[PDB]
Design a protein around this ligand. Structure first.
Ligand SMILES: N[C@@H](Cc1ccccc1)C(=O)N[C@@H](Cc1ccc(O)cc1)C(=O)O
Ligand SMILES: N[C@@H](Cc1ccccc1)C(=O)N[C@@H](Cc1ccc(O)cc1)C(=O)O
Lengths: 81, 81
């Protein structure tokens, strides 16, 4: 399905959840201003998914060494470059 | 227990982990530039702690509706304002 809405500095990030914005060259913003646009995805009737590698439980590698699901992120070696 | 080092915009955040910086009016920065300063804590001989309310597994409320441990953060109603 489509990648979720872009977000963050220079739009270089992508939403991984309502309040989670991440990018390989940015790290992850959780609940910060950078992730506010990510709540808008809730209004879009089509499914979206960001990232490429599955990790944790229902999560995906969102940034260097970081795994995120729609409600949280945690450091994960499997997600390291 | 001393509070961990300050970090983030206007120094309004506090470190919850080597690469996690959170603040009540900021949200949480996970692996972003804002959290680089938090690596210094690793070399301070005294233990530190941020937040006042325990949550999830070994985490503490770091921001409105967010629970963080030194390894990550997740949405948690128990942390709502
Ligand atoms: N567009 C939303 C809602 C939706 C979910 C499933 C099917 C159709 C619509 C969406 O895709 N939400 C994601 C989760 C998510 C991801 C990013 C974000 O900024 C907010 C939520 C999903 O459930 O797959
Ligand atoms: N000061 C560090 C290391 C230390 C731990 C225990 C006793 C003495 C020193 C520290 O307190 N680390 C925290 C975790 C942490 C928090 C913020 C941060 O920027 C980096 C690490 C701990 O282990 O409690």
């Amino acid at each position: 399905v489509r990648t979720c809405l872009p977000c963050g500095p220079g739009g270089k990030g992508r939403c991984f959840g309502p309040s989670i914005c991440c990018g390989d060259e940015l790290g992850c913003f959780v609940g910060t201003a950078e992730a506010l646009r990510c709540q808008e995805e809730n209004y879009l009737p089509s499914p979206c998914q960001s990232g490429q590698k599955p990790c944790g439980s229902g999560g995906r590698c969102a940034a260097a060494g970081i795994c995120c699901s729609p409600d949280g992120c945690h450091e994960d070696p499997a997600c390291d470059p």
